[PDB]
Design a protein around this motif. Structure first.
Motif, PDB file in Angstrom:
ATOM      1  N   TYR A   1       0.828  -1.186   0.000  1.00 39.04           N
ATOM      2  CA  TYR A   1       0.000   0.000   0.000  1.00 39.04           C
ATOM      3  C   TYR A   1       0.879   1.259   0.000  1.00 39.04           C
ATOM      4  O   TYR A   1       2.102   1.163   0.049  1.00 39.04           O
ATOM      5  CB  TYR A   1      -0.984  -0.028   1.192  1.00 39.04           C
ATOM      6  CG  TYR A   1      -0.422   0.489   2.490  1.00 39.04           C
ATOM      7  CD1 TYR A   1      -0.950   1.639   3.077  1.00 39.04           C
ATOM      8  CD2 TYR A   1       0.645  -0.160   3.133  1.00 39.04           C
ATOM      9  CE1 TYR A   1      -0.439   2.138   4.269  1.00 39.04           C
ATOM     10  CE2 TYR A   1       1.167   0.331   4.329  1.00 39.04           C
ATOM     11  CZ  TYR A   1       0.611   1.485   4.891  1.00 39.04           C
ATOM     12  OH  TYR A   1       1.104   1.997   6.069  1.00 39.04           O
TER      13      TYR A   1
ATOM     14  N   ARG B   1       1.692   4.341   2.127  1.00 41.05           N
ATOM     15  CA  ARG B   1       1.548   4.881   3.478  1.00 41.05           C
ATOM     16  C   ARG B   1       1.265   6.388   3.529  1.00 41.05           C
ATOM     17  O   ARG B   1       0.748   6.866   4.532  1.00 41.05           O
ATOM     18  CB  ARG B   1       2.746   4.513   4.378  1.00 41.05           C
ATOM     19  CG  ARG B   1       3.989   5.423   4.261  1.00 41.05           C
ATOM     20  CD  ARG B   1       5.064   5.044   5.296  1.00 41.05           C
ATOM     21  NE  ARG B   1       5.989   6.143   5.605  1.00 41.05           N
ATOM     22  CZ  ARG B   1       7.148   6.382   4.984  1.00 41.05           C
ATOM     23  NH1 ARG B   1       7.566   5.608   3.985  1.00 41.05           N
ATOM     24  NH2 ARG B   1       7.893   7.417   5.365  1.00 41.05           N
TER      25      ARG B   1
ATOM     26  N   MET C   1      -7.384   0.907   3.184  1.00 40.82           N
ATOM     27  CA  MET C   1      -6.028   1.148   2.703  1.00 40.82           C
ATOM     28  C   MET C   1      -5.909   1.329   1.208  1.00 40.82           C
ATOM     29  O   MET C   1      -6.575   0.659   0.426  1.00 40.82           O
ATOM     30  CB  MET C   1      -5.101   0.052   3.163  1.00 40.82           C
ATOM     31  CG  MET C   1      -4.451   0.465   4.410  1.00 40.82           C
ATOM     32  SD  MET C   1      -4.827  -0.688   5.693  1.00 40.82           S
ATOM     33  CE  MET C   1      -6.535  -1.179   5.444  1.00 40.82           C
TER      34      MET C   1
ATOM     35  N   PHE D   1       6.432  -4.184  11.982  1.00 39.12           N
ATOM     36  CA  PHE D   1       5.177  -3.489  11.856  1.00 39.12           C
ATOM     37  C   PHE D   1       5.255  -2.230  12.716  1.00 39.12           C
ATOM     38  O   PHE D   1       5.317  -2.322  13.941  1.00 39.12           O
ATOM     39  CB  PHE D   1       4.017  -4.393  12.285  1.00 39.12           C
ATOM     40  CG  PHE D   1       3.839  -5.610  11.418  1.00 39.12           C
ATOM     41  CD1 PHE D   1       3.962  -6.886  11.953  1.00 39.12           C
ATOM     42  CD2 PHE D   1       3.555  -5.486  10.064  1.00 39.12           C
ATOM     43  CE1 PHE D   1       3.802  -8.009  11.156  1.00 39.12           C
ATOM     44  CE2 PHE D   1       3.388  -6.605   9.264  1.00 39.12           C
ATOM     45  CZ  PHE D   1       3.514  -7.864   9.809  1.00 39.12           C
TER      46      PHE D   1
ATOM     47  N   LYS E   1       0.764  -2.920   9.805  1.00 33.14           N
ATOM     48  CA  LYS E   1       1.377  -2.124   8.753  1.00 33.14           C
ATOM     49  C   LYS E   1       2.887  -1.985   8.875  1.00 33.14           C
ATOM     50  O   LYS E   1       3.414  -1.757   9.958  1.00 33.14           O
ATOM     51  CB  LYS E   1       0.761  -0.733   8.727  1.00 33.14           C
ATOM     52  CG  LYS E   1      -0.691  -0.741   8.441  1.00 33.14           C
ATOM     53  CD  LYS E   1      -1.272   0.650   8.623  1.00 33.14           C
ATOM     54  CE  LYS E   1      -2.704   0.698   8.148  1.00 33.14           C
ATOM     55  NZ  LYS E   1      -3.380   1.959   8.603  1.00 33.14           N
TER      56      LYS E   1
ATOM     57  N   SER F   1       3.810  -2.148   3.302  1.00 36.00           N
ATOM     58  CA  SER F   1       2.923  -3.291   3.177  1.00 36.00           C
ATOM     59  C   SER F   1       2.106  -3.455   4.426  1.00 36.00           C
ATOM     60  O   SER F   1       2.421  -2.902   5.477  1.00 36.00           O
ATOM     61  CB  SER F   1       3.716  -4.568   2.915  1.00 36.00           C
ATOM     62  OG  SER F   1       4.493  -4.923   4.050  1.00 36.00           O
ATOM     63  N   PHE F   2       1.043  -4.227   4.302  1.00 36.14           N
ATOM     64  CA  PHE F   2       0.194  -4.503   5.437  1.00 36.14           C
ATOM     65  C   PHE F   2      -0.249  -5.956   5.425  1.00 36.14           C
ATOM     66  O   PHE F   2      -0.258  -6.614   4.375  1.00 36.14           O
ATOM     67  CB  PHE F   2      -0.994  -3.555   5.457  1.00 36.14           C
ATOM     68  CG  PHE F   2      -1.949  -3.736   4.308  1.00 36.14           C
ATOM     69  CD1 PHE F   2      -1.880  -2.903   3.193  1.00 36.14           C
ATOM     70  CD2 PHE F   2      -2.930  -4.718   4.348  1.00 36.14           C
ATOM     71  CE1 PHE F   2      -2.767  -3.052   2.135  1.00 36.14           C
ATOM     72  CE2 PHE F   2      -3.816  -4.874   3.294  1.00 36.14           C
ATOM     73  CZ  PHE F   2      -3.738  -4.037   2.187  1.00 36.14           C
TER      74      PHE F   2
END
Length: 321
Positions: free
Chosen positions: A18, A20, A42, A292, A309, A313-314
């Motif tokens: 994603y 951020r 997201m 994370f 997150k 990436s998540f």
């Protein structure tokens, strides 16, 4: 108002990249029953398309794709949902594109009249959306036509980086990491904002208004300050007690917390205990799999999920019985 079920098992539902820097506000929505679910969202902006992944619980994860309206393919800073497939996209220079998320058509292009960077934009306030300056200009703008107004003017002595709106839709908290937390009343323009005391060294990460209607929970880096809004400005709901290898998040009730530890790679659940008046450790789960640095909790009838997150990436992890 449901108590969180006892949960010892977790499964990985989703891994995705994603963006951020695309601030995507969590939108409330009403059930085919009569309560509101918080949807958490997201955005991955890639190849001139926007990819929105959303969930209100662990049962349903949706990802919607939309083109990116900007011809240079530049990323929106803030994205927020409006009524009827409207999508509000805030671009640098205080320019807002309303896009229809079903048709992919551009409906409107609005240039907001403010020299200061727009720092808050929300659409489920339903003919108007609300926006806010980093100087505390707050305005309402109509989706369809020119109807608009300013409930509060820009101050010289603040900077905000974010905002959150109370469920009764009248209290707007604007804030920044360094400790500034100012609550504005949108019903009376002539009313001065209330300054809430947060020491400057405790970095403010997020502010939430709890479901009870009177807890404003201030999530700091290593600690949580919960203000009671019924009482004199500055009155805590409970005293602040601390419980950089640990990110956490609190649900909308303000009484459930999931904390992730990067040392042990595990999720710990804290409950705010009504007798003992503190956050008490309830359950711990080891994750099987980068660090994370952020997380969000969701839960609905479907079940509890944590969105973990990184910087790019998540991971969506379910918490099951």
């Amino acid at each position: 108002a449901p108590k969180w079920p006892i949960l010892k098992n977790l499964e990985l539902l989703q891994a995705q990249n994603y963006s951020r820097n695309i601030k995507t506000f969590p939108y409330k929505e009403l059930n085919k029953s009569m309560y509101y679910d918080k949807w958490v969202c997201m955005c991955r902006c890639e190849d001139g398309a926007l990819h929105f992944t959303q969930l209100k619980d662990s049962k349903t994860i949706t990802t919607i794709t939309t083109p990116n309206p900007r011809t240079g393919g530049e990323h929106p800073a803030i994205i927020s949902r409006g009524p009827c497939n409207r999508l509000l996209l805030l671009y640098p220079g205080n320019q807002i594109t309303i896009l229809d998320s079903k048709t992919n058509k551009v409906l409107r292009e609005i240039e907001v009249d403010s020299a200061n960077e727009i720092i808050y934009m929300y659409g489920h306030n339903t003919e108007y959306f609300i926006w806010a300056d980093n100087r505390g200009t707050i305005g309402f703008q109509s989706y369809e036509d020119d109807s608009q107004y300013i409930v509060h003017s820009a101050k010289s002595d603040v900077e905000y980086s974010s905002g959150v709106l109370h469920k009764d839709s009248l209290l707007l908290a604007l804030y920044s990491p360094d400790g500034i937390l100012d609550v504005y009343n949108l019903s009376s323009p002539d009313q001065a904002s209330s300054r809430f005391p947060v020491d400057e060294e405790a970095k403010i990460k997020e502010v939430k208004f709890a479901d009870n209607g009177y807890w404003m929970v201030v999530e700091c880096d290593q600690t949580v300050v919960c203000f009671d809004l019924r009482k004199d400005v500055g009155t805590l709901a409970y005293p602040t007690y601390t419980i950089g290898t640990v990110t956490y998040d609190i649900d909308d009730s303000g009484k459930n917390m999931i904390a992730y530890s990067n040392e042990s790679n595990s999720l710990t659940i804290y409950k705010f205990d009504k007798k003992t008046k503190n956050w008490t450790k309830d359950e711990e789960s080891a994750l099987c799999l980068a660090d994370f640095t952020d997380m969000d909790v969701v839960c609905g009838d479907g079940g509890i999920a944590a969105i973990l997150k990184t910087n790019d990436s998540f991971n969506i992890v379910a918490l099951t019985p």
